[PDB]
């Protein structure tokens, strides 16, 4: 796995943090503006949140 969050798309980031943290209590979640492609890492400590320009879930978000 549940290293992904589609049930929370079309919502802004806090709403998502909220959800994600519900799912994986320890998810230290930082946000990122969609398009800002990132890493092939395992930062399990996080649910990478590619959001839009008005912090809504533009892409489905996921962990590491």
Swiss-Prot record:
Entry's Gene Ontology molecular function annotations: serine-type endopeptidase inhibitor activity
GO biological process: response to wounding
Keywords: Protease inhibitor, Serine protease inhibitor
Origin superkingdom: Eukaryota
Site (Reactive bond): 40-41
Family the entry assigns: Belongs to the protease inhibitor I13 (potato type I serine protease inhibitor) family.
Function: Inhibits both subtilisin and chymotrypsin.
Protein name: Subtilisin-chymotrypsin inhibitor-2A
Highest classification ranks of the organism: Eukaryota, Viridiplantae, Streptophyta, Embryophyta, Tracheophyta
Location of this fragment in the whole protein: 21 to 84 of 84
């Amino acid at each position: 796995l549940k290293t992904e969050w589609p049930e929370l798309v079309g919502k802004s980031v806090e709403e998502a943090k909220k959800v994600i943290l519900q799912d994986k209590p320890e998810a230290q979640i930082i946000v990122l503006p969609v398009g800002t492609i990132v890493t092939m890492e395992y930062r399990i400590d996080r649910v990478r949140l590619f959001v839009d320009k008005l912090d809504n879930i533009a892409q489905v978000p996921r962990v590491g």
